[PDB]
């Protein structure tokens, strides 16, 4: 009859063993106060999710066990099943598995049977799928493990676990959504319920097609659906969004926290296991296509999952998932990844180089709304968090109430003007960093940059004009360009001195402001600014900045924000001549930011080339453009993204938020020397043109 | 009886179809020329080894069969069998394949049936391995190809080649690498010859691994043995360096260049058939195992691979492989990597900042052993290379043949002194470039150190002190980093506008300078010239680039080098008190070169974390070191390593050579925020300390 | 590029082989002056899906193909790929089949192999799944139509057909929600379009879970979905109501009547191909979790279903589905039930 079970997000670090075993040990201990007789934990949360290369080191595997065994000799695991995770080599092969215990027992080690092999996953790298369906093997324990539990061998494979009063299976992260999941079978075979730990990292406003997902398996299976997710940065470039759920029969009954400054958040929920039986009798209480298949084996638990607290015990009540906006989304994801990156670089803040335009504007956002973050929680009793800021600010009886004052603390704004710059966008800077609080920075480079080009005129004889006063389209941009990576000599020169020249130990990461679309295009100076330490905007699309920034406004009442929306988009380092105005940077790249995006997802997303894509858009834009002019724009594209594409290589790590980013360490791996004149697949598109240029 | 073969390695380019599609038919012209009846070419020639994510574009598989209808409509192509690799979709599964064509009709298309998934290689990224072994499927053609091919399918999967005289079987790269490789079955089911693409790159030391596994196969297997490989720069960090080969019953018979500049290189031997037949004739244990081998599909093709040619056409005689020294492949390796870099990046030249130390100077030795490479394949009547020169010189006219007037055109060496700067290493750098004939410019930083520095005293109402002068760690290290990150900024001018002063056209390639050993440890500060286009010897170990300077000397004939050698290791950026002789590199790591490749090595060559590490080392250096130390020395290299990994994430490519790279993109996978201070692991070495020290 | 396909409902009538051909004409010729190249019918609309016991009359089978050979020698059937449902005895086993037929030939017939037997249904009284996967047989063609079509045999099983431009895929009525269904592997196979004809009678409130499902299923595996199904009285208790629909990658792109007074509806619809294509890319355009599986018999049909009226034709946008109150549903149903009651009886009125 009623049972109560657990899940949980928690926020894991990669090979930080110590904290991952603290972690477990804190959810678990949270599930039985709550009265939990099951607690699932997310994938490979021991040893964090994100240990990339480190998986083929033995060490990781060892450190995995040495946690385990921590694990089963602790008081605190008593009358409560366990499902963790760890890497577990069977025979010289290596699984990501699900390690469930019981009373200092291990009672089946259960390996994944799908890998992630797309984007940002590559789990085939150090891992192989259970190919044995239906079938478990021996698994020989540790010594180290024997001696505590006492058993020679355990079942490792696909198996469930029937208990005095219920039947548990395993689905893991992405066999949820794989071509014949477990879930299936494990319904027919009369399972229950379905454990599935996650390791999914945010992804802009895809967070609905997880709970749609097994929301549609819980209604079309019946049963109790589990899911638990790692939540926060595990140390690279992914937020994981632990949207940890407990559904049943179609219905949600604990929704998770998707961005939140919690390091250990945990889901309860009590159900009558009698409305799935009755659920499904609902459906089909008859048989089924006749299908014969070999059946899942059984691993018998001599335990019972519900346990006499019927009596005060209350059923959980259905509720509705709400999800955040996608500006919500931008001004806490970003916002929690740049707390984590804080709080364990052990840096002593930020160093934003401030332009007074819109995206280092929205970086300023992020961090503000990071502050507001850790005041609603110190206010709501964190003491993880408390403990935190106290240790980066360095005073012990602090305690942040208002949000300008902790990022006064926290957050240095740096503007840099050259020549040329207005005193418009210096006032904005200055501005919007009065009314967010940060330290604000107000130079001039001009002396730096009158310096280096003294050095070249004093060794080549000859002095570099700007366009606008006779200079040469070369000469023009070097000069632009010398100014542009003077401000990052000096960004990261205060970033490191600073607060030295303060009176105060410690040093800033030094905050970068590339967006995704100009990223893709190469449309940056190589090492300017766009290269600084870490980049919580790199993944953001520019209208979603905008859109972003503007939601700022009422949010945090933060008007300065008003103006950098409504000026002019300009990149002030050359002199205007007269008669004429600054050029935009839309004008500049040759399409808008809106076309660019297109070009992006149809790039990435829809996986097009040059030719498939011409084809595309032709139809897309039939009425707006002509096939000899979608040709062009087409052309321009590939042309500009495949010279600027090196630019890429070296560009500053950022948080990831769309799945059409152009980052090449982990999300899009391509080449950097092309050929750039794409003859072949230009001379296909031409011809397609030519075709249809023979019609009236 | 006698049949003419031959292979080849083919500088192929990602997506360059046109020049891909010439390439190929080069070297079917030059195989027929010289009496071949079947053409092997390297894997996935049609549209380069490494287009990565661009085989998830349905273009590349589109553009792929464009190509392959091209070849099949070719003249050229009549009468010899052609086996040409792409990517095919079948039944909607994407696989690496081999396609066979004669004579206007498609014979089989062999999938790969093993991927390559480790170090840079991630073929699962995108393609499907075939799975069932010695069987075959329709593949139904492209309409595009039935019109010109007139057939409507054709084979797919393990099936062998059948004619007249012979049987022709395929092992596609890794398959022989795998432990039950193909050529086993193929051999006992009397396959003949076998025939492997391969796309495998440079690594140093390794060439001989790769000659001795052909060998040793047909030497256990009997048989012919075809390997070809691409040659050169396809568009990334990687160097393919064609080893292609000929090999019968454990003889080679064709050794094909490891490094050249030709674009199409073809062996062909001419072998007997009866030479296969009666060696293998002649093993009792294998014929009493192939008169019980199961059979393969074998697809019947209507043509004799020997023909009216055997009217004394010479048997091809045993040859012995001739390997490079490690220094040689060194002097050729990145050298043939950065004309191909050069050429395929219409760029004008190179400007490397040049120190007067070890490195820098290797750098500027690699681009001399270039140019004496061009002049080289230019006096062997190389027309692609004479015309890359011409165009990269904009002199149609041109002839190098002086190796010195070649290094001043395409090479700008920048000697960048700061206050500190000693008087010898500049007239190092400046003897060095007038050896190796490049234009040299030499400069003071100084002007421009003073005015960034004066832009922070402006604002912060302080002034930053070398700790010379009683400046604090961190003022004395800021200090230094600005002076680098100068040189970095000037470096990009000049690299911009150099050319410009001296009034020609272009721009030019930044060289990087950092080994390998630094880019582990993260010993270099980032953005500084550690910072460029592309680092020639980002791969390199400490050890092997003054192995490989003092192989210069002679070699090259450059006195120069002597003195850089026996010169001190210094980074003279700060003033030295009096009484005190600057700090070395070495001391300044904390750790000898020397120990520190062993680190390096024991890191990733054999996957050890530190609590493994410090195990293997306490052995190791048992004699010289305490158990206490050794604890000392894998904590410190372990700490510095992970609060400086994010130097990885933004660092410049470098040429792959080492297999202990540390390079983040694609070879070596790792977090970059780490949890410094390895609690766990750390408490588990000084566990194992307190346990030796009770202990004796 | 851009096809255009239509699926219908039709009020059939239990043995009613003559007005059962005339629907079905009817239907194939408003789908091609509507310009499909393909059109899709209900279960078993030949003899109409409500025979019972009759099924173990082998006149049905008799007469079934009788109407079978009236369709294939028919003018209007030119130039369209036509799938209808009849039984179809195959090695003395009877199955519940699409006989789908292009240009006076046989091209496939396709047996059930999930088998309804829940409520009122009980198909295994009369039909046997098929059971062997992924796998065709010789089908022996009655000396009728081999005169008639110049084949001596035709492929009988689990097979998908391929054209010069695509790739259809069959999904029987409760297939689409029995586990491991056709559409998953005919996805992963790349199956373009998978029609499902249907009989399922109306159940109050239950419509959108039909909806939802082929909804969900084209947004899970990408590609076009085919439904349709019997409207109207077939000859006892149950009223079918043909919620017949067109859907493609999670979009709904044409709405059947649930209730109507039309002896045939037929719904069509011009969708780009390649929109299906480039969907798929945006889910997984890799590999998955290695699977390995006996793949899909294919055959081979030479047709293009794609032929030059892009020049003109309309792409059809995405609907949303409209639903009926149950006051609606109570209002209509029963009525409509009524109406095919009195019709049919050939009685004078009620009391
Ligand atoms: N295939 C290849 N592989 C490796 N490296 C390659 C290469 N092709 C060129 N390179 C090299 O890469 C280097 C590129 O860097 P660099 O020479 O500095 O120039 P680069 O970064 O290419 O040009 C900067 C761009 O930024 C734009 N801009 C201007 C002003 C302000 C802003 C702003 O929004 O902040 C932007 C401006 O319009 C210009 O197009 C060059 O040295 C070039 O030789
Ligand atoms: N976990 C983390 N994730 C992301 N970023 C992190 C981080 N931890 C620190 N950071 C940040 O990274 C930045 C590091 O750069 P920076 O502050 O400039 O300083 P950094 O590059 O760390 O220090 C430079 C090193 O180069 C050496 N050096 C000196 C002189 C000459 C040479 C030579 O051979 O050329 C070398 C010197 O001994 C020193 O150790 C800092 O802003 C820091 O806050
Ligand atoms: N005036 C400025 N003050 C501070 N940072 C700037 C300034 N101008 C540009 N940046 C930085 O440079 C990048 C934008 O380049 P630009 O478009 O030329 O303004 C972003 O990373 C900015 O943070
Ligand atoms: N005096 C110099 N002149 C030119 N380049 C230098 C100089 N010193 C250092 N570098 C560059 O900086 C890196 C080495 O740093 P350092 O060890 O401090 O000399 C290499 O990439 C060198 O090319
Ligand atoms: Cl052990
Ligand atoms: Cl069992
Ligand atoms: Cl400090
Ligand atoms: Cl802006
Ligand atoms: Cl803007
Ligand atoms: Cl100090
Ligand atoms: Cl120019
Ligand atoms: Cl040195
Ligand atoms: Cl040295
Ligand atoms: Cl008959
Ligand atoms: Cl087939
Ligand atoms: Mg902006
Ligand atoms: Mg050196």
Redesign the pocket.
């Given at each position: 009859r009623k049972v109560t079970v657990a899940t949980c997000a928690l926020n894991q670090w990669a090979l930080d063993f110590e904290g991952n075993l603290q972690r477990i040990l804190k959810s678990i201990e949270i599930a039985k106060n709550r009265g939990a007789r099951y607690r699932l934990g997310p994938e490979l949360e021991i040893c964090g999710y994100g240990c990339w290369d480190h998986y083929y080191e033995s060490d990781t595997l060892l450190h995995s066990f040495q946690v385990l065994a921590a694990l089963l000799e602790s008081p605190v695991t008593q009358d409560i099943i366990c499902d963790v995770g760890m890497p577990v080599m069977h025979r010289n092969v290596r699984y990501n598995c699900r390690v469930i215990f019981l009373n200092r027992k291990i009672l089946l080690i259960r390996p994944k049977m799908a890998l992630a092999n797309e984007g940002n996953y590559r789990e085939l790298r150090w891992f192989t799928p259970w190919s044995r369906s239906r079938h478990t093997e021996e698994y020989f324990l540790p010594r180290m493990i024997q001696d505590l539990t006492k058993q020679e061998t355990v079942p490792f494979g696909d198996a469930v676990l029937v208990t005095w009063d219920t039947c548990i299976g395993s689905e893991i992260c992405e066999e949820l959504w794989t071509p014949h999941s477990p879930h299936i079978d494990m319904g027919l075979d009369g399972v229950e319920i379905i454990t599935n730990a996650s390791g999914s990292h945010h992804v802009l406003r895809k967070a609905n097609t997880r709970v749609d997902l097994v929301t549609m398996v819980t209604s079309k299976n019946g049963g109790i659906y589990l899911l638990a997710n790692q939540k926060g940065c595990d140390g690279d470039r992914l937020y994981y969004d632990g949207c940890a759920m407990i559904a049943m029969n179609g219905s949600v009954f604990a929704q998770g926290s998707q961005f939140s400054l919690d390091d250990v958040e945990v889901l309860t929920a009590t159900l009558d296991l009698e409305d799935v039986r009755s659920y499904r009798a609902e459906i089909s209480s008859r048989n089924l296509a006749a299908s014969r298949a070999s059946p899942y084996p059984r691993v018998k638990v001599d335990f019972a999952l519900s346990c006499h607290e019927d009596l005060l015990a209350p059923i959980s009540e259905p509720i509705e998932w709400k999800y955040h906006s996608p500006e919500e989304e931008i001004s806490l994801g970003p916002a929690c990844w740049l707390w984590d990156?804080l709080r364990?670089?052990?840096?002593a803040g930020f160093?934003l180089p401030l332009s007074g335009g819109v995206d280092s504007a929205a970086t300023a956002c992020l961090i503000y709304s990071m502050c507001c973050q850790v005041c609603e929680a110190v206010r709501s009793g964190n003491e993880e968090v408390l403990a935190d800021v106290r240790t980066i600010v360095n005073q012990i009886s602090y305690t942040p109430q208002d949000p300008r004052d902790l990022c006064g603390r926290i957050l240095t704004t740096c503007y840099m003007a050259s020549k040329n710059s207005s005193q418009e966008t210096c006032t904005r800077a200055r501005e919007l960093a009065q009314q967010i609080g940060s330290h604000h920075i107000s130079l001039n480079i001009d002396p730096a940059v009158k310096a280096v080009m003294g050095i070249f005129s004093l060794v080549t004889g000859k002095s570099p004009l700007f366009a606008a006063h006779g200079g040469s389209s070369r000469e023009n941009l070097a000069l632009q360009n010398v100014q542009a990576r003077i401000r990052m000599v000096l960004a990261?020169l205060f970033?490191?001195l600073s607060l030295w020249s303060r009176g105060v130990h410690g040093?800033?990461?030094?905050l970068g402001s590339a967006n995704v679309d100009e990223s893709l295009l190469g449309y940056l100076t190589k090492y300017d600014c766009s290269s600084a330490?870490?980049n919580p905007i790199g993944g953001i699309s520019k209208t979603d900045l905008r859109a972003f920034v503007q939601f700022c406004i009422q949010r945090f009442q933060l008007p300065a924000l008003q103006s950098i929306l409504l000026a002019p988009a300009t990149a002030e380092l050359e002199p205007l001549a007269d008669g004429q105005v600054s050029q935009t940077d839309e004008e500049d790249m040759g399409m808008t930011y809106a076309e660019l995006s297109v070009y992006g997802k149809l790039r990435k997303v829809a996986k097009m080339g040059p030719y498939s894509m011409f084809c595309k858009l032709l139809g897309m834009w039939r009425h707006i453009c002509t096939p000899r002019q979608v040709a062009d724009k087409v052309k321009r594209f590939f042309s500009k993204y495949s010279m600027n594409r090196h630019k890429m290589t070296t560009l500053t790590?950022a948080y990831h938020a769309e799945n059409y980013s152009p980052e090449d360490n982990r999300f899009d791996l391509r080449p950097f020397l092309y050929n750039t004149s794409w003859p072949w697949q230009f001379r296909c598109i031409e011809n397609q043109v030519l075709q249809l240029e023979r019609a009236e």
């Open positions: 990156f364990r670089s052990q840096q160093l990261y970033a490191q040093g800033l990461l030094v330490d870490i790590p």
